[PDB]
Symmetry: none
């Protein structure tokens, strides 16, 4: 039970599965809680599998199996690296790291070249619409889509799990006041890299497979159609991304320090 | 067989059912031909039943029954007035004569107050969208919607079947060179009306129940997304409306002349 | 003019209106001829509107309007079905099809349970008297009343216009020597009925609204008081009913044969 | 006022006009009381003027005028002999003293030769019927008629006012115990009569012009149709006749005694 | 007996029959007294029946019968109106009210146009002579005749009994000091007359049938031939007329006053 | 340093590297100790890589790299599974699990079908000779070869590391006195197997990659040529195999018990 919490902790989703499993809750409630957390985790992982139906259920074998559009991909006790090697073939990333898949599925997708003027009309007067990726604030990207009575905004800053481990390794290496040890790690970083130099291991760690690369902000009802509030969710998602991406680089520095 | 042709002739649709029934065609082909003609007729009648699934099939009793969303409404041998009293309760007309129903069904409908600027975006970048009624060229109205990969434009000039019989009665009455008989019909028109004066009967005539009030122009593929060609179909539908509405007022003058 | 003749032909009354209209007769004579024929027709139709003052007059609009106790009910050019839907609310039929109205109006009505002994006294010694309905010869009924110096006898065999069309349809269907076509009409008669099977239309036909259901035999002077001659008019009315009802079922078979 | 009471006292009708005139009642009430009493008096006088509309009204000249079908006949202050000479020409008596007029007016009248069997039918099943005169119990006569919802029975024993004065004169003359005076009146009765002998004068007396010759018993509602109760009113009228005719011969003996 | 006194009191003749009947006088004396009084009454009544032999006799029936030239006219107990209707057909009055009959009978009658000079010769030297009517003093008339040794002078002022009742009614009506009641009787006199207004009845009164209209003064012996004394009897008769006619209008005012 | 001891402990070779690294010994001595232990371990692992020159040396990066015929295969800190996936492609196992490679290399190899008579001659009179695999005592196999002045005997009982983990799992599962839990593990063993049932993980354990499958007994000098002593080393190697294979199945039961 605690392994799924650490697997859901790499996306900013507090599942409380270890507390819900001990809460003596029925299987119908446990399955719904584990399913609603992996969906909020898949939206923060940047996998771009929104077109897939993510689900989770506990097996009678004493394990938890992941579900994707009907077919089982992997199990919980099979390690955090087995699930990453299962959703990777179902994911298509471009040269920037974004998902080329459309969240709505088969249909039309407006390009990222569309001005903000034509977007307010598709937010106030349209039914179903999906946009591609466009350059956001700073070095980030953003995409929007609306399905049914719910509007979704996914501001993303692509960053792989390996690149995330190398960034946190250079932060703890630069914070070394000992100039002799800081030079020794800088000499080994020229060949093995920033990660292999600080270590002179983390294959079972969940942070080495899934990282935070996007944020999903939702809106339903009449707010999902007002163009003024849509401009307030893109900043609420870009700020929830800077805080989430700023907290994972700090939790990773507390582990590689040893 | 010939009754369905006259019933389809009041909407500008040449069904050729009397030629197809004598063509020794199978029932599968006869049902498809009668179904594709009533759909093109319902779109030219102005009933606004586009949200309903119109169908037609020949019965083993030797008759033809009309179909609407599964439930049979009326039969062909039951007269052209029985079908009009069946689709009227399923139709909702405002004070102008237009259908308040949305062609797409449940969802959002952009109002007729939207400028043409926000419409090109919903034609070039949107998936499913439907508009309400707006004032068109002259004294006409227009509405547009797109379902799947097909875009539909329905320019409409509301005119009931009774108002159509009264207009054709004043045209033949004004064309009377005999000033004495023209004055006599004008004296009886002050009470009985323009129709009851020329007649001093047409309950079994199909033109007294269904009239032309709109035109349906369709486009599929990439043409259903280009905003330049969408501006060419609205005029192709408004011209196909002036010609169709101009030919029904002439065929009605050739009958009331007797 | 010819429409009122066919409307008066369904009751065995030869009005000769088409010959009287062309006879260049004044309006006073034309109104009296059309009025005396509808009264003799209403007495043979079984409507039981004898308590109402039936009248008819030609309108200056080129039409003929029916009159009943002062208020206009319908017009001639309004079809033979409009007049039937107008006199029906003024008619009250029991479970047998007879008129519950008293021909004399407000007063006393002797029941049909009265013997023939007490009737001769009311025929020879009474002034105004009216009887209710009693079972006549065969499956018929009979009623008698006397107003002023005129005695009236109305032998009736109730039969609606729809039941009359179904009886004539089974006679032409039984006369089919072709056993294959006779079986085909018998197979469709199990659901649509005897009328809908022979037809695989007659809404404008006058025979589909008014049928012969009674006969009115009158007597005035001293003959309207002799009990011996009153027994001779009831048979003269029951025989004039079998012949009239036997001729309408033959004229209806000559139309449905096509 | 008191003269109309004595004029109404010769028919067994207590009018109480002298008490009603002093009762300070309006003219509308006084006219109705005097009218309802002369009608009940005319029915007991045997005049047979039931076909005439009897009425009475007080004149502004201080007198009371009699009314019959609209035209004034006589006045009250003109003596009781003037009214008798006015209704006599409007009365037609046969050789027996009965009124040949029919109470119902123009129409049919069943003869007195009709058995009681055919009468119960005309009482239970008929509307309006009137009978002629037939020999009743003893030396009396009887006639019946029904108008509207009221049945009337008039048992009559014809007796003129002059014959009534001669009968009461022989009763007081036979009651004379003095054989000498009884013989003297019998000797003068051989020429002058029974009346002129007892007197050796009464022209102003109301009893010398109007006498009781019939009785009117009425019934309304459902009782006016039951044959069992009709047999109870004929005896209630024949007994009310023997008592009324037996009391007038006693009041006349109390006057001629002087 | 007292009825003949009141019948003789309307002519100024005091018969005293009620005193003579109680005087136990024989029938021969009673007949002579009643005969001599009716003759003096007929001469004062103005009936002009002097040519008739007036007589009166009491009947054994207890009544008194009037006699005129042998044939009985009426009886006393038959009322004072029966005798007036009996002597009227035997009387012939002109337009002035005088009797056209000659008192002497068949013969010659000198006209009223004769001067007084030729009259003295017919009074002093003639035997039997009779004059017609001539205008007397004032508005009166006079006539003279002589039969045997008796000369008769009849000064007359014609006045019917009805006109006498109307004159006495205007005298009591004019003597009304109450101006309101005098106006009320004057308002009813415009239609009913002066008699019917004061009464708002007197058919049995003798004054309503016989009135004083002449006076008979007689002379016999040598005085019936002296012309000087004949001029003294005409004034003695004209004065006995003004007093008698002046006393009847006073006795009539004492009766109508009630 | 301690990881290479656990990596050398799965072959019955006590390297004492953690004690030699802390012994402050030079790199020349540390490299020789780590090299002589992996060679004695590769001979007990059954890999059949005797034809390859196995070597080991500590890297200046703080790690230990494995060496095989000159080319580096893997490193020590790369896990015990990386080295197993490196020597597997250099190993060729038949259907029984034995190495098809000849220990001497290119040359001739006497088959296992050779009798023991012809083997004593090749042990007492030959120089270089190598034998293939032949069925040994029980279910084991054996092979012999001599290179230079040293004779080698390798008695082998093929058993993969996965089959070794499944055997130790059935021993701890059969030793369960709790019959309910023993039945539950037997129910899950029908599908997941004996290993997956006891666990309801050991990827980083060295015992899950390298197991004991053979024993290498050596002899040099004149003893490497006496046929009597060669028969004493094959039993000294088959007994050193039963003890080594009997001690690894006991150390594996002490780990899977948790």
């Amino acid at each position: 039970y605690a392994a799924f919490d650490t697997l859901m902790s790499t996306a900013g989703v507090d599942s409380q599965i270890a507390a819900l499993a001990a809460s003596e809750a029925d299987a119908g409630t446990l399955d719904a809680a584990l399913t609603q957390s992996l969906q909020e985790a898949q939206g923060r992982w940047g996998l771009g599998l929104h077109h897939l139906r993510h689900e989770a259920r506990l097996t009678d074998d004493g394990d938890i199996e992941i579900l994707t559009d009907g077919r089982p991909s992997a199990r919980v006790s099979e390690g955090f690296g087995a699930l990453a090697q299962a959703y990777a073939p179902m994911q298509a990333l471009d040269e920037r790291g974004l998902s080329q898949w459309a969240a709505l599925g088969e249909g039309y997708r407006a390009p990222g070249d569309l001005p903000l003027a034509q977007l307010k009309v598709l937010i106030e007067h349209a039914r179903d619409f999906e946009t591609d990726w466009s350059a956001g604030r700073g070095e980030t990207f953003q995409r929007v889509w609306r399905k049914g009575d719910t509007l979704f905004v996914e501001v993303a800053r692509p960053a792989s799990a390996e690149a995330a481990l190398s960034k946190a390794a250079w932060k703890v290496i630069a914070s070394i006041k000992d100039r002799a040890f800081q030079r020794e790690l800088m000499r080994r970083s020229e060949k093995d890299g920033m990660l292999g130099a600080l270590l002179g291991n983390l294959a079972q760690l969940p942070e080495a497979h899934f990282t935070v690369q996007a944020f999903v902000q939702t809106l339903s009802g009449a707010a999902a159609r007002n163009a003024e509030e849509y401009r307030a969710a893109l900043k609420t998602a870009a700020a929830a991304l800077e805080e989430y991406q700023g907290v994972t680089t700090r939790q990773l520095s507390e582990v590689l320090r040893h």
